[PDB]
Amino acid sequence: THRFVQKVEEMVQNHMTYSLQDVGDANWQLVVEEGEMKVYRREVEENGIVLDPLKATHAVKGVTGHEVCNYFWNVDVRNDWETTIENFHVVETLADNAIIIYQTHKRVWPASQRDVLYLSVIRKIPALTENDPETWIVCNFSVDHDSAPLNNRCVRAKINVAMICQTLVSEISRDNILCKITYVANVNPGGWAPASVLRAVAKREYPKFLKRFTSYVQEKTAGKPILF
Ligand SMILES: CC(C)(C)c1cc(-c2ccc(S(=O)(=O)CCO)cc2)cc([C@@H]2C[C@@H]2c2ccccn2)c1
């Protein structure tokens, strides 16, 4: 019971209430569709800066949500799949399922480099009823911290990202399992950046990040006991 338990609970529950809802919803603009993966955005600017909420859904054969979330959360494999960061440092271990991370992102010309400081928590949400599936969720959201590094080259972004996973099973085989992912990211670039750049990056890099990440999960897990 670290100092962030109540805030974690609130971020997680807002995701379970809002992020999981189907989008039908003309609010969401469907931007990219490649097979199982659908990527939506809303066009939002605050103080002239692009904030466009991003939401993707995906269906990945042969993995569970527990697996997907472990791989997304576990800093030990962070460097194998991650293509967006130059460095990260674990600032603080809060619990066996919660840490605070500092990371610097690769520069995207011509915007300044960004850094981010966030709490990352992995959580299992038991089936609400015996009909409903259980859910595994990772939430990454920005927090303040006294041991925040000094990085004069970087503008501080703020993020609220969730990777939310439900598992369908049709002796259980990988052939028989399907992980349904909803992934959401609300990123505040934290100072001026060209609108066109942020939008092209999002539109090109989110589908790649997600197909790449999930392909890595399928690969790391294939022919290994199923961790439900
Ligand atoms: C533009 C866009 C795609 C919405 C964006 C997305 C991310 C982002 C953040 C976190 C995650 S994660 O899923 O929590 C995995 C651990 O990192 C994935 C992606 C970061 C930026 C950084 C703000 C900085 C930035 C600023 C200017 C140009 C390029 N990049 C911009």
PDB file of C-alpha atoms and ligand atoms in Angstrom:
ATOM      1  CA  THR A   1       0.000   0.000   0.000  1.00  0.00           C
ATOM      2  CA  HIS A   2       2.270   2.738  -1.411  1.00  0.00           C
ATOM      3  CA  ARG A   3       1.276   6.398  -1.651  1.00  0.00           C
ATOM      4  CA  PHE A   4      -0.297   5.993  -5.108  1.00  0.00           C
ATOM      5  CA  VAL A   5      -2.831   3.225  -4.418  1.00  0.00           C
ATOM      6  CA  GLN A   6      -5.902   5.459  -4.550  1.00  0.00           C
ATOM      7  CA  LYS A   7      -4.781   7.337  -7.686  1.00  0.00           C
ATOM      8  CA  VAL A   8      -3.965   4.029  -9.393  1.00  0.00           C
ATOM      9  CA  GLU A   9      -7.403   2.730  -8.504  1.00  0.00           C
ATOM     10  CA  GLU A  10      -9.041   5.788 -10.005  1.00  0.00           C
ATOM     11  CA  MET A  11      -7.010   5.705 -13.272  1.00  0.00           C
ATOM     12  CA  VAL A  12      -7.643   2.010 -13.716  1.00  0.00           C
ATOM     13  CA  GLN A  13     -11.389   2.297 -13.080  1.00  0.00           C
ATOM     14  CA  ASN A  14     -11.803   5.247 -15.475  1.00  0.00           C
ATOM     15  CA  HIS A  15     -10.144   3.082 -18.112  1.00  0.00           C
ATOM     16  CA  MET A  16     -12.428   0.162 -17.317  1.00  0.00           C
ATOM     17  CA  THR A  17     -15.452   2.493 -17.510  1.00  0.00           C
ATOM     18  CA  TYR A  18     -14.507   4.579 -20.535  1.00  0.00           C
ATOM     19  CA  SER A  19     -11.640   3.140 -22.508  1.00  0.00           C
ATOM     20  CA  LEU A  20     -13.242  -0.295 -23.013  1.00  0.00           C
ATOM     21  CA  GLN A  21     -16.468   1.054 -24.547  1.00  0.00           C
ATOM     22  CA  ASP A  22     -16.979   0.301 -28.233  1.00  0.00           C
ATOM     23  CA  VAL A  23     -16.512   3.212 -30.691  1.00  0.00           C
ATOM     24  CA  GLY A  24     -20.662   3.164 -33.855  1.00  0.00           C
ATOM     25  CA  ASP A  25     -19.367   6.400 -32.197  1.00  0.00           C
ATOM     26  CA  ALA A  26     -18.867   8.976 -35.030  1.00  0.00           C
ATOM     27  CA  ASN A  27     -16.847  10.932 -32.430  1.00  0.00           C
ATOM     28  CA  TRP A  28     -13.944   8.636 -33.164  1.00  0.00           C
ATOM     29  CA  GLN A  29     -12.458   9.025 -36.585  1.00  0.00           C
ATOM     30  CA  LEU A  30     -11.259   5.672 -37.913  1.00  0.00           C
ATOM     31  CA  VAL A  31      -7.775   6.629 -39.280  1.00  0.00           C
ATOM     32  CA  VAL A  32      -6.058   3.313 -40.155  1.00  0.00           C
ATOM     33  CA  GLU A  33      -7.312  -0.322 -40.467  1.00  0.00           C
ATOM     34  CA  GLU A  34      -4.893  -3.183 -41.136  1.00  0.00           C
ATOM     35  CA  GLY A  35      -6.618  -6.533 -40.680  1.00  0.00           C
ATOM     36  CA  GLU A  36      -7.491  -7.104 -37.043  1.00  0.00           C
ATOM     37  CA  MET A  37      -6.068  -3.719 -36.023  1.00  0.00           C
ATOM     38  CA  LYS A  38      -8.260  -0.584 -36.075  1.00  0.00           C
ATOM     39  CA  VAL A  39      -6.807   2.787 -35.053  1.00  0.00           C
ATOM     40  CA  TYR A  40      -8.984   5.837 -34.188  1.00  0.00           C
ATOM     41  CA  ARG A  41      -8.283   9.420 -33.112  1.00  0.00           C
ATOM     42  CA  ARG A  42     -10.170  12.540 -32.066  1.00  0.00           C
ATOM     43  CA  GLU A  43      -8.860  15.860 -33.284  1.00  0.00           C
ATOM     44  CA  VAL A  44      -8.212  17.969 -30.169  1.00  0.00           C
ATOM     45  CA  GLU A  45      -5.945  20.976 -29.594  1.00  0.00           C
ATOM     46  CA  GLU A  46      -5.360  22.790 -26.320  1.00  0.00           C
ATOM     47  CA  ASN A  47      -3.608  26.169 -26.333  1.00  0.00           C
ATOM     48  CA  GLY A  48      -2.844  25.441 -29.998  1.00  0.00           C
ATOM     49  CA  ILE A  49      -1.093  22.155 -29.196  1.00  0.00           C
ATOM     50  CA  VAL A  50      -2.224  18.788 -30.681  1.00  0.00           C
ATOM     51  CA  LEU A  51      -3.579  16.447 -27.970  1.00  0.00           C
ATOM     52  CA  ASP A  52      -5.478  14.063 -30.342  1.00  0.00           C
ATOM     53  CA  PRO A  53      -6.677  11.103 -28.151  1.00  0.00           C
ATOM     54  CA  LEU A  54      -5.726   7.814 -29.781  1.00  0.00           C
ATOM     55  CA  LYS A  55      -7.606   4.539 -29.477  1.00  0.00           C
ATOM     56  CA  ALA A  56      -6.776   1.242 -31.130  1.00  0.00           C
ATOM     57  CA  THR A  57      -8.368  -2.199 -31.010  1.00  0.00           C
ATOM     58  CA  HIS A  58      -6.656  -5.400 -32.017  1.00  0.00           C
ATOM     59  CA  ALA A  59      -7.150  -9.200 -31.941  1.00  0.00           C
ATOM     60  CA  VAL A  60      -3.997 -11.298 -31.566  1.00  0.00           C
ATOM     61  CA  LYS A  61      -3.999 -15.093 -31.895  1.00  0.00           C
ATOM     62  CA  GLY A  62      -2.004 -17.312 -29.586  1.00  0.00           C
ATOM     63  CA  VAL A  63      -1.391 -15.059 -26.537  1.00  0.00           C
ATOM     64  CA  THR A  64      -3.249 -14.234 -23.364  1.00  0.00           C
ATOM     65  CA  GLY A  65      -3.920 -10.819 -21.895  1.00  0.00           C
ATOM     66  CA  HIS A  66      -1.780 -11.776 -18.934  1.00  0.00           C
ATOM     67  CA  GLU A  67       1.129 -12.460 -21.274  1.00  0.00           C
ATOM     68  CA  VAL A  68       0.567  -9.280 -23.311  1.00  0.00           C
ATOM     69  CA  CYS A  69       0.405  -7.155 -20.171  1.00  0.00           C
ATOM     70  CA  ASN A  70       3.482  -8.748 -18.571  1.00  0.00           C
ATOM     71  CA  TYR A  71       5.528  -8.094 -21.663  1.00  0.00           C
ATOM     72  CA  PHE A  72       4.229  -4.527 -21.930  1.00  0.00           C
ATOM     73  CA  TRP A  73       4.954  -3.857 -18.278  1.00  0.00           C
ATOM     74  CA  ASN A  74       8.142  -5.727 -17.599  1.00  0.00           C
ATOM     75  CA  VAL A  75      11.089  -3.232 -17.848  1.00  0.00           C
ATOM     76  CA  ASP A  76      13.511  -6.170 -18.303  1.00  0.00           C
ATOM     77  CA  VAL A  77      12.355  -6.721 -21.894  1.00  0.00           C
ATOM     78  CA  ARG A  78      11.465  -3.061 -22.465  1.00  0.00           C
ATOM     79  CA  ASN A  79      14.476  -2.607 -24.751  1.00  0.00           C
ATOM     80  CA  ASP A  80      13.581  -5.548 -27.012  1.00  0.00           C
ATOM     81  CA  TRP A  81      10.371  -4.259 -28.498  1.00  0.00           C
ATOM     82  CA  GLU A  82      10.463  -0.555 -27.743  1.00  0.00           C
ATOM     83  CA  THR A  83      11.433   1.662 -30.705  1.00  0.00           C
ATOM     84  CA  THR A  84      10.400   5.085 -29.387  1.00  0.00           C
ATOM     85  CA  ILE A  85      12.826   5.737 -26.515  1.00  0.00           C
ATOM     86  CA  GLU A  86      16.485   6.573 -26.279  1.00  0.00           C
ATOM     87  CA  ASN A  87      16.791   5.870 -22.522  1.00  0.00           C
ATOM     88  CA  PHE A  88      14.654   4.981 -19.533  1.00  0.00           C
ATOM     89  CA  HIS A  89      15.509   4.775 -15.841  1.00  0.00           C
ATOM     90  CA  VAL A  90      13.377   3.227 -13.118  1.00  0.00           C
ATOM     91  CA  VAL A  91      12.985   6.084 -10.602  1.00  0.00           C
ATOM     92  CA  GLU A  92      11.150   4.256  -7.814  1.00  0.00           C
ATOM     93  CA  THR A  93       9.724   0.820  -7.118  1.00  0.00           C
ATOM     94  CA  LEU A  94       6.347   1.289  -5.536  1.00  0.00           C
ATOM     95  CA  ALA A  95       5.233  -2.356  -5.309  1.00  0.00           C
ATOM     96  CA  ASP A  96       5.586  -5.638  -7.123  1.00  0.00           C
ATOM     97  CA  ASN A  97       3.145  -4.337  -9.766  1.00  0.00           C
ATOM     98  CA  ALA A  98       4.019  -0.611  -9.748  1.00  0.00           C
ATOM     99  CA  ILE A  99       7.089   1.441 -10.622  1.00  0.00           C
ATOM    100  CA  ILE A 100       7.804   5.064 -11.628  1.00  0.00           C
ATOM    101  CA  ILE A 101       9.770   5.460 -14.848  1.00  0.00           C
ATOM    102  CA  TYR A 102      11.683   8.339 -16.418  1.00  0.00           C
ATOM    103  CA  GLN A 103      12.369   8.043 -20.158  1.00  0.00           C
ATOM    104  CA  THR A 104      13.582  10.172 -23.036  1.00  0.00           C
ATOM    105  CA  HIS A 105      12.079   9.704 -26.465  1.00  0.00           C
ATOM    106  CA  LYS A 106      13.897   9.722 -29.807  1.00  0.00           C
ATOM    107  CA  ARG A 107      13.825  13.190 -31.413  1.00  0.00           C
ATOM    108  CA  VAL A 108      11.297  13.742 -34.244  1.00  0.00           C
ATOM    109  CA  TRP A 109      12.568  16.559 -36.515  1.00  0.00           C
ATOM    110  CA  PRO A 110      12.027  19.430 -36.049  1.00  0.00           C
ATOM    111  CA  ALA A 111      10.424  19.256 -32.603  1.00  0.00           C
ATOM    112  CA  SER A 112      12.459  19.328 -29.364  1.00  0.00           C
ATOM    113  CA  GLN A 113      13.102  16.023 -27.701  1.00  0.00           C
ATOM    114  CA  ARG A 114      10.509  15.042 -25.111  1.00  0.00           C
ATOM    115  CA  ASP A 115      10.933  13.278 -21.755  1.00  0.00           C
ATOM    116  CA  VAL A 116       8.189  11.731 -19.563  1.00  0.00           C
ATOM    117  CA  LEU A 117       7.879  10.639 -15.932  1.00  0.00           C
ATOM    118  CA  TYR A 118       5.154   8.164 -15.225  1.00  0.00           C
ATOM    119  CA  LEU A 119       3.767   5.513 -12.917  1.00  0.00           C
ATOM    120  CA  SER A 120       3.368   2.190 -14.632  1.00  0.00           C
ATOM    121  CA  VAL A 121       1.055  -0.367 -12.991  1.00  0.00           C
ATOM    122  CA  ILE A 122      -0.150  -3.821 -14.089  1.00  0.00           C
ATOM    123  CA  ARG A 123      -3.488  -5.024 -12.614  1.00  0.00           C
ATOM    124  CA  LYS A 124      -5.912  -7.961 -12.995  1.00  0.00           C
ATOM    125  CA  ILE A 125      -9.615  -6.996 -12.920  1.00  0.00           C
ATOM    126  CA  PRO A 126     -11.602 -10.148 -11.979  1.00  0.00           C
ATOM    127  CA  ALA A 127     -14.641 -11.091 -14.044  1.00  0.00           C
ATOM    128  CA  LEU A 128     -17.490  -8.821 -12.911  1.00  0.00           C
ATOM    129  CA  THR A 129     -19.993 -11.707 -13.412  1.00  0.00           C
ATOM    130  CA  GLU A 130     -19.300 -15.342 -14.400  1.00  0.00           C
ATOM    131  CA  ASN A 131     -20.328 -14.313 -17.944  1.00  0.00           C
ATOM    132  CA  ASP A 132     -17.939 -11.385 -18.201  1.00  0.00           C
ATOM    133  CA  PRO A 133     -14.242 -12.008 -19.039  1.00  0.00           C
ATOM    134  CA  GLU A 134     -11.515 -11.021 -16.672  1.00  0.00           C
ATOM    135  CA  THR A 135      -9.285  -8.169 -17.875  1.00  0.00           C
ATOM    136  CA  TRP A 136      -5.591  -7.458 -17.510  1.00  0.00           C
ATOM    137  CA  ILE A 137      -4.624  -3.796 -17.813  1.00  0.00           C
ATOM    138  CA  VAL A 138      -1.391  -1.855 -17.828  1.00  0.00           C
ATOM    139  CA  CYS A 139      -1.711   1.836 -17.086  1.00  0.00           C
ATOM    140  CA  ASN A 140       1.085   4.351 -17.609  1.00  0.00           C
ATOM    141  CA  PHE A 141       0.217   7.819 -16.371  1.00  0.00           C
ATOM    142  CA  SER A 142       2.316  10.883 -15.583  1.00  0.00           C
ATOM    143  CA  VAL A 143       3.160  11.711 -11.955  1.00  0.00           C
ATOM    144  CA  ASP A 144       5.392  14.214 -10.153  1.00  0.00           C
ATOM    145  CA  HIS A 145       8.528  13.022  -8.387  1.00  0.00           C
ATOM    146  CA  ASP A 146      11.289  14.707  -6.372  1.00  0.00           C
ATOM    147  CA  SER A 147      14.036  12.629  -7.972  1.00  0.00           C
ATOM    148  CA  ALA A 148      12.976  13.751 -11.468  1.00  0.00           C
ATOM    149  CA  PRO A 149      16.182  14.053 -13.628  1.00  0.00           C
ATOM    150  CA  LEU A 150      17.367  17.394 -15.054  1.00  0.00           C
ATOM    151  CA  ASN A 151      17.332  17.294 -18.893  1.00  0.00           C
ATOM    152  CA  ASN A 152      17.596  20.779 -20.414  1.00  0.00           C
ATOM    153  CA  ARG A 153      17.352  19.397 -24.002  1.00  0.00           C
ATOM    154  CA  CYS A 154      13.933  17.819 -23.296  1.00  0.00           C
ATOM    155  CA  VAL A 155      10.332  19.187 -23.011  1.00  0.00           C
ATOM    156  CA  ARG A 156       8.284  17.259 -20.464  1.00  0.00           C
ATOM    157  CA  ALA A 157       5.350  15.406 -22.016  1.00  0.00           C
ATOM    158  CA  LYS A 158       2.437  14.077 -19.965  1.00  0.00           C
ATOM    159  CA  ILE A 159       0.826  10.723 -20.810  1.00  0.00           C
ATOM    160  CA  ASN A 160      -2.105   8.538 -19.835  1.00  0.00           C
ATOM    161  CA  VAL A 161      -1.822   5.232 -21.700  1.00  0.00           C
ATOM    162  CA  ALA A 162      -3.636   1.921 -21.101  1.00  0.00           C
ATOM    163  CA  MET A 163      -3.123  -1.475 -22.692  1.00  0.00           C
ATOM    164  CA  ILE A 164      -6.302  -3.368 -21.834  1.00  0.00           C
ATOM    165  CA  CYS A 165      -6.627  -7.049 -22.640  1.00  0.00           C
ATOM    166  CA  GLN A 166      -9.436  -9.647 -22.595  1.00  0.00           C
ATOM    167  CA  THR A 167      -8.791 -13.283 -23.480  1.00  0.00           C
ATOM    168  CA  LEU A 168     -11.082 -15.656 -25.403  1.00  0.00           C
ATOM    169  CA  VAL A 169     -10.493 -19.427 -25.342  1.00  0.00           C
ATOM    170  CA  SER A 170     -12.373 -21.573 -27.875  1.00  0.00           C
ATOM    171  CA  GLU A 171      -6.229 -29.453 -23.116  1.00  0.00           C
ATOM    172  CA  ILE A 172      -5.879 -25.815 -24.215  1.00  0.00           C
ATOM    173  CA  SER A 173      -3.753 -24.946 -27.217  1.00  0.00           C
ATOM    174  CA  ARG A 174      -2.298 -21.608 -28.417  1.00  0.00           C
ATOM    175  CA  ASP A 175      -4.364 -22.243 -31.593  1.00  0.00           C
ATOM    176  CA  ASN A 176      -7.421 -21.888 -29.372  1.00  0.00           C
ATOM    177  CA  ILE A 177      -6.678 -18.573 -27.717  1.00  0.00           C
ATOM    178  CA  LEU A 178      -7.403 -14.986 -28.813  1.00  0.00           C
ATOM    179  CA  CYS A 179      -6.337 -11.816 -26.996  1.00  0.00           C
ATOM    180  CA  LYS A 180      -8.573  -8.784 -27.624  1.00  0.00           C
ATOM    181  CA  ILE A 181      -6.692  -5.540 -26.981  1.00  0.00           C
ATOM    182  CA  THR A 182      -7.902  -2.063 -26.508  1.00  0.00           C
ATOM    183  CA  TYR A 183      -5.003   0.384 -26.378  1.00  0.00           C
ATOM    184  CA  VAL A 184      -5.512   4.096 -25.590  1.00  0.00           C
ATOM    185  CA  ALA A 185      -3.013   6.962 -25.379  1.00  0.00           C
ATOM    186  CA  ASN A 186      -3.642  10.529 -24.359  1.00  0.00           C
ATOM    187  CA  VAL A 187      -0.394  12.383 -24.802  1.00  0.00           C
ATOM    188  CA  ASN A 188       0.258  15.998 -24.044  1.00  0.00           C
ATOM    189  CA  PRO A 189       3.526  16.974 -25.859  1.00  0.00           C
ATOM    190  CA  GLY A 190       3.945  19.548 -23.099  1.00  0.00           C
ATOM    191  CA  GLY A 191       4.877  22.596 -25.148  1.00  0.00           C
ATOM    192  CA  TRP A 192       4.735  23.603 -28.811  1.00  0.00           C
ATOM    193  CA  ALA A 193       5.289  21.001 -31.544  1.00  0.00           C
ATOM    194  CA  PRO A 194       4.109  21.250 -35.186  1.00  0.00           C
ATOM    195  CA  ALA A 195       0.610  19.878 -35.539  1.00  0.00           C
ATOM    196  CA  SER A 196       1.314  18.185 -38.887  1.00  0.00           C
ATOM    197  CA  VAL A 197       4.275  16.335 -37.386  1.00  0.00           C
ATOM    198  CA  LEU A 198       2.412  15.005 -34.332  1.00  0.00           C
ATOM    199  CA  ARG A 199      -0.435  13.773 -36.535  1.00  0.00           C
ATOM    200  CA  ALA A 200       1.725  12.064 -39.147  1.00  0.00           C
ATOM    201  CA  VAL A 201       3.809  10.397 -36.416  1.00  0.00           C
ATOM    202  CA  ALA A 202       0.698   9.155 -34.660  1.00  0.00           C
ATOM    203  CA  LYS A 203      -0.908   7.929 -37.879  1.00  0.00           C
ATOM    204  CA  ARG A 204       2.246   6.116 -39.060  1.00  0.00           C
ATOM    205  CA  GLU A 205       3.921   4.989 -35.831  1.00  0.00           C
ATOM    206  CA  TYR A 206       1.053   3.768 -33.647  1.00  0.00           C
ATOM    207  CA  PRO A 207      -0.024   0.958 -36.033  1.00  0.00           C
ATOM    208  CA  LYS A 208       3.630  -0.046 -36.381  1.00  0.00           C
ATOM    209  CA  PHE A 209       4.309   0.098 -32.697  1.00  0.00           C
ATOM    210  CA  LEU A 210       1.282  -2.078 -31.998  1.00  0.00           C
ATOM    211  CA  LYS A 211       1.770  -4.640 -34.738  1.00  0.00           C
ATOM    212  CA  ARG A 212       5.438  -4.841 -33.806  1.00  0.00           C
ATOM    213  CA  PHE A 213       4.857  -5.170 -30.045  1.00  0.00           C
ATOM    214  CA  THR A 214       2.155  -7.838 -30.451  1.00  0.00           C
ATOM    215  CA  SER A 215       4.282  -9.806 -32.957  1.00  0.00           C
ATOM    216  CA  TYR A 216       7.056  -9.828 -30.421  1.00  0.00           C
ATOM    217  CA  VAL A 217       4.663 -11.197 -27.790  1.00  0.00           C
ATOM    218  CA  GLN A 218       3.539 -14.013 -30.092  1.00  0.00           C
ATOM    219  CA  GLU A 219       7.178 -14.806 -30.799  1.00  0.00           C
ATOM    220  CA  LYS A 220       8.460 -14.784 -27.186  1.00  0.00           C
ATOM    221  CA  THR A 221       5.596 -16.992 -26.009  1.00  0.00           C
ATOM    222  CA  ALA A 222       5.216 -19.532 -28.812  1.00  0.00           C
ATOM    223  CA  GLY A 223       5.832 -23.086 -27.533  1.00  0.00           C
ATOM    224  CA  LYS A 224       6.029 -21.988 -23.922  1.00  0.00           C
ATOM    225  CA  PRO A 225       3.363 -22.938 -21.245  1.00  0.00           C
ATOM    226  CA  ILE A 226       0.287 -20.680 -21.507  1.00  0.00           C
ATOM    227  CA  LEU A 227       0.248 -18.167 -18.690  1.00  0.00           C
ATOM    228  CA  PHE A 228      -3.448 -17.359 -18.283  1.00  0.00           C
TER     229      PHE A 228
HETATM  230  C1  LIG B   1       2.749  11.632 -31.098  1.00  0.00           C
HETATM  231  C2  LIG B   1       2.272  10.450 -30.206  1.00  0.00           C
HETATM  232  C3  LIG B   1       2.312   9.180 -31.049  1.00  0.00           C
HETATM  233  C4  LIG B   1       0.828  10.731 -29.694  1.00  0.00           C
HETATM  234  C5  LIG B   1       3.270  10.142 -29.068  1.00  0.00           C
HETATM  235  C6  LIG B   1       3.182   8.878 -28.362  1.00  0.00           C
HETATM  236  C7  LIG B   1       4.115   8.574 -27.295  1.00  0.00           C
HETATM  237  C8  LIG B   1       4.046   7.321 -26.534  1.00  0.00           C
HETATM  238  C9  LIG B   1       4.194   7.404 -25.113  1.00  0.00           C
HETATM  239  C10 LIG B   1       4.138   6.222 -24.328  1.00  0.00           C
HETATM  240  C11 LIG B   1       3.939   4.986 -25.008  1.00  0.00           C
HETATM  241  S1  LIG B   1       3.795   3.500 -23.977  1.00  0.00           S
HETATM  242  O1  LIG B   1       2.758   2.792 -24.859  1.00  0.00           O
HETATM  243  O2  LIG B   1       3.444   4.033 -22.541  1.00  0.00           O
HETATM  244  C12 LIG B   1       5.315   2.442 -23.953  1.00  0.00           C
HETATM  245  C13 LIG B   1       6.423   3.021 -23.060  1.00  0.00           C
HETATM  246  O3  LIG B   1       6.873   4.221 -23.677  1.00  0.00           O
HETATM  247  C14 LIG B   1       3.774   4.879 -26.427  1.00  0.00           C
HETATM  248  C15 LIG B   1       3.864   6.060 -27.174  1.00  0.00           C
HETATM  249  C16 LIG B   1       5.100   9.550 -26.964  1.00  0.00           C
HETATM  250  C17 LIG B   1       5.211  10.771 -27.661  1.00  0.00           C
HETATM  251  C18 LIG B   1       6.272  11.683 -27.185  1.00  0.00           C
HETATM  252  C19 LIG B   1       5.675  13.046 -26.921  1.00  0.00           C
HETATM  253  C20 LIG B   1       6.954  12.912 -27.732  1.00  0.00           C
HETATM  254  C21 LIG B   1       7.151  13.499 -29.119  1.00  0.00           C
HETATM  255  C22 LIG B   1       7.124  14.897 -29.327  1.00  0.00           C
HETATM  256  C23 LIG B   1       7.337  15.461 -30.596  1.00  0.00           C
HETATM  257  C24 LIG B   1       7.582  14.579 -31.647  1.00  0.00           C
HETATM  258  C25 LIG B   1       7.601  13.201 -31.355  1.00  0.00           C
HETATM  259  N1  LIG B   1       7.414  12.654 -30.130  1.00  0.00           N
HETATM  260  C26 LIG B   1       4.288  11.086 -28.698  1.00  0.00           C
END
